[PDB]
Amino acid sequence: EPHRFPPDFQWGVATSSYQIEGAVEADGRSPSIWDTFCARPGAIADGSTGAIANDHYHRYREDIAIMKQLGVNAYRFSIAWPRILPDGRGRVNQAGVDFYERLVDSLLEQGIEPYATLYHWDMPQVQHDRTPWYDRGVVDAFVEYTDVITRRLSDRVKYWMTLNEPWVISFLGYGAGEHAPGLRDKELYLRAAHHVLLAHGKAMPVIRANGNAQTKAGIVLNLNWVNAASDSPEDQAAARRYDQFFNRWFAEPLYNGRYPEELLEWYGRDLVPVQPGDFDIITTPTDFLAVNYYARTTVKAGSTDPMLQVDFVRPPGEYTAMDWEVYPQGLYNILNWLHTDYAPPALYVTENGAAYDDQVSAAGEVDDPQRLAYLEGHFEAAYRAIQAGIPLKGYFVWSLMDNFEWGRGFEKRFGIVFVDYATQQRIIKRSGKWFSQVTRANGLP
Ligand SMILES: OC[C@H]1O[C@@H](O[C@H]2[C@H](O)[C@@H](O)[C@H](O)O[C@@H]2CO)[C@H](O)[C@@H](O)[C@@H]1O
Numbered sequence: 315e316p317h318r319f320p321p322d323f324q325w326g327v328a329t330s331s332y333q334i335e336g337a338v339e340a341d342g343r344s345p346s347i348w349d350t351f352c353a354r355p356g357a358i359a360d361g362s363t364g365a366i367a368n369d370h371y372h373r374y375r376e377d378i379a380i381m382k383q384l385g386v387n388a389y390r391f392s393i394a395w396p397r398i399l400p401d402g403r404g405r406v407n408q409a410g411v412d413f414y415e416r417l418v419d420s421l422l423e424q425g426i427e428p429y430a431t432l433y434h435w436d437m438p439q440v441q442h443d444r445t446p447w448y449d450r451g452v453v454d455a456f457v458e459y460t461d462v463i464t465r466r467l468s469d470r471v472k473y474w475m476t477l478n479e480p481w482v483i484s485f486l487g488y489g490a491g492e493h494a495p496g497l498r499d500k501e502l503y504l505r506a507a508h509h510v511l512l513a514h515g516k517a518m519p520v521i522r523a524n525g526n527a528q529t530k531a532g533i534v535l536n537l538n539w540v541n542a543a544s545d546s547p548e549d550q551a552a553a554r555r556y557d558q559f560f561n562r563w564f565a566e567p568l569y570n571g572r573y574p575e576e577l578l579e580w581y582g583r584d585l586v587p588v589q590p591g592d593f594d595i596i597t598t599p600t601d602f603l604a605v606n607y608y609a610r611t612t613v614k615a616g617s618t619d620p621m622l623q624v625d626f627v628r629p630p631g632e633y634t635a636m637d638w639e640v641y642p643q644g645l646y647n648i649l650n651w652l653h654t655d656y657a658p659p660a661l662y663v664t665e666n667g668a669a670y671d672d673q674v675s676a677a678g679e680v681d682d683p684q685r686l687a688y689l690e691g692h693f694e695a696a697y698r699a700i701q702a703g704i705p706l707k708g709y710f711v712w713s714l715m716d717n718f719e720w721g722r723g724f725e726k727r728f729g730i731v732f733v734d735y736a737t738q739q740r741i742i743k744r745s746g747k748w749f750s751q752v753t754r755a756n757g758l759p
């Protein structure tokens with residue numbers, strides 16, 4: 315009774331283009347909305363940018379050898395639209411495509427299966443100027459990008475993800491002003507949310523036509539376990555609204571052709587630019603649903619957030635350096651909800667991980683026992699999910715390595731591999747050495 319995973323379980327690590335690649339001007343790449351936004355004062359907590367990051371653009375081969383040390387059989391990465399179509403549409407940048415050709419070729423030669431994210435938040439600035447997410451024109455721009463890159467790579471990439479975390483793209487980007495392009499307006503958020511779902515749905519047939527019969531595609535949702543602070547009818551109502559906002563806003567359209575009705579009413583139903591036939595596109599069948607899970611969020615009635623009329627409560631427990639509650643049972647809960655409610659033929663955890671404060675010891679080691687316990691607890695939740703019949707087919711750790719953590723900059727380290735930014739030295743952390751044995755044993759000791 316070592317608690318062992320299915321024989322073909324996919325163990326991986328995950329990254330994104332803007333977070334690791336650097337070389338922002340190299341080889342015809344144009345600025346993204348994140349190259350622009352990092353210039354805004356107050357936007358990035360340490361005042362940094364992703365200009366250099368981990369220099370993975372130049373160092374991908376060495377990072378792939380690290381992946382071999384970790385024993386992963388899968389790697390989740392994103393493709394930078396600004397490298398592929400630097401004018402947003404039209405003329406293909408061959409040198410951009412060629413990077414991803416080299417990366418994928420090197421992965422397959424090392425026996426690592428490529429899982430490619432098409433959109434992980436780095437729209438070309440010149441394209442945003444024409445089609446922000448709140449503009450319906452964004453959809454055909456994204457499909458065109460999709461068409462170009464899947465035509466080149468689909469002989470080698472079988473697993474495709476359309477867009478990473480619709481909730482982040484639309485709400486953090488356009489509703490809270492935390493993420494590029496840094497706007498703060500309820501209507502823009504809801505419009506962006508709708509066009510993200512529509513971009514997903516129109517890209518699906520294009521991915522399948524450019525591939526073969528083995529091609530698999532779906533979306534990536536962030537989902538957290540939501541909890542009411544108390545039993546009071548108004549804490550329960552507040553938690554329900556927040557869950558509709560965070561967890562059901564995209565899932566309900568994707569599986570049931572509808573937005574959560576009472577939140578839609580609350581917002582103002584006309585702010586969502588639904589045209590006839592849009593739900594038919596959004597519900598296009600997927601091969602899987604990918605989940606990015608990190609925390610439990612506990613909610614009470616209040617006015618900290620005036621849009622939703624909720625406050626966040628922090629229950630007594632363990633918190634990461636992001637101030638996120640560690641709650642591995644939440645992963646089981648989310649996976650079981652999705653299974654019972656939507657019956658996806660396959661689920662993947664495409665992100666799960668933790669930021670803790672890391673230090674390189676005298677001996678050159680990074681001793682991260684809190685990160686290791688975080689991962690151990692969550693792998694255990696995933697194992698129980700599988701035993702209950704949930705079709706979880708793989709698990710990607712966020713992240714391969716420390717990287718540019720968006721509005722937190724480089725101060726928040728999610729890697730199981732430490733990166734010394736002064737030298738670009740990678741050091742596998744204790745959690746990474748433990749992971750090295752989980753992957754090889756296909757399970758927990
Ligand atoms: O949980 C509410 C909290 O979300 C923060 O964004 C996270 C999100 O929780 C997670 O699910 C997703 O995968 O990543 C984003 C970006 O780090 C957000 O930064 C907070 O403002 C918000 O209160």
Ligand SMILES: OC[C@H]1O[C@@H](O)[C@H](O)[C@@H](O)[C@@H]1O
Nearest residue numbers: 330478479482606665712719
């Ligand atoms: O915040 C931790 C991670 O959460 C997810 O929102 C994203 O896909 C990552 O790019 C991010 O760094």
